[PDB]
Amino acid sequence: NVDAILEPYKTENARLVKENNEMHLGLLKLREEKDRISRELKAYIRKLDHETSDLKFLNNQYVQKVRSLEKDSNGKTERI
Amino acid sequence: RNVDAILEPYKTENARLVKENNEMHLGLLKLREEKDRISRELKAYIRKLDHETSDLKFLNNQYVQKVRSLEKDSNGKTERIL
Known part of the structure; x- marks a missing residue:
C-alpha cells in the first residue's frame, strides 16, 4: 500500500533525474563546442596577425628602398 | 504523518530537480547564443584581417612594379653617363 x-x-x-x-x-x-571553436578561430587569428605584421614590415622595407632609389635617381641627375 | x-x-x-x-x-x-555570438565575432575579425592582407598584397605588388621602374631608370641614367 505504501x-x-x-x-x-x-x-x-x-x-526528473x-x-x-x-x-x-x-x-x-x-x-566544449564553444571552447573548441574559440581556441581554433583565435589561433587562426594569431596566424593572420603574424602575416599582417610581416606584410606591414615588408611594405615599410619597400618605402625605405623607394626613398633610397629616389635619392640615387636625383644624385645621377646632378651628375648629368 | 508517516505517509x-x-x-x-x-x-x-x-x-x-524541477x-x-x-x-x-x-x-x-x-x-x-554565446557560441553563435563568439563564432560571428571571430569569423568577422578574420574577414577584417583577410581584407588587410589582400590590400597589403596588392600594395606590395604596386611597390614591386615601382622598384622595377626605378631600377630601370637608375640603369638607363648610368648608360647615359658612360
Whole structure:
C-alpha cells in the first residue's frame, strides 16, 4: 500500500533525474563546442596577425628602398 | 504523518530537480547564443584581417612594379653617363 502511494512520486523523480542528467551532459557538450571553436578561430587569428605584421614590415622595407632609389635617381641627375 | 514522512524526500528532491532543470534549460539557450555570438565575432575579425592582407598584397605588388621602374631608370641614367 505504501508502494502504491509512493509509485507516482518515484516515477516522477525518475523522469526528473533522467532530464537533469541529459541537461548536464548537453551543457558540457555545448561548452566544449564553444571552447573548441574559440581556441581554433583565435589561433587562426594569431596566424593572420603574424602575416599582417610581416606584410606591414615588408611594405615599410619597400618605402625605405623607394626613398633610397629616389635619392640615387636625383644624385645621377646632378651628375648629368 | 508517516505517509508524509515517507514522501517528503521525493517531494523536496523533485522540487529541487524541477528548479535545476528549468535553470539549465535557460542555461542551454544562453550558451547556444554565446557560441553563435563568439563564432560571428571571430569569423568577422578574420574577414577584417583577410581584407588587410589582400590590400597589403596588392600594395606590395604596386611597390614591386615601382622598384622595377626605378631600377630601370637608375640603369638607363648610368648608360647615359658612360
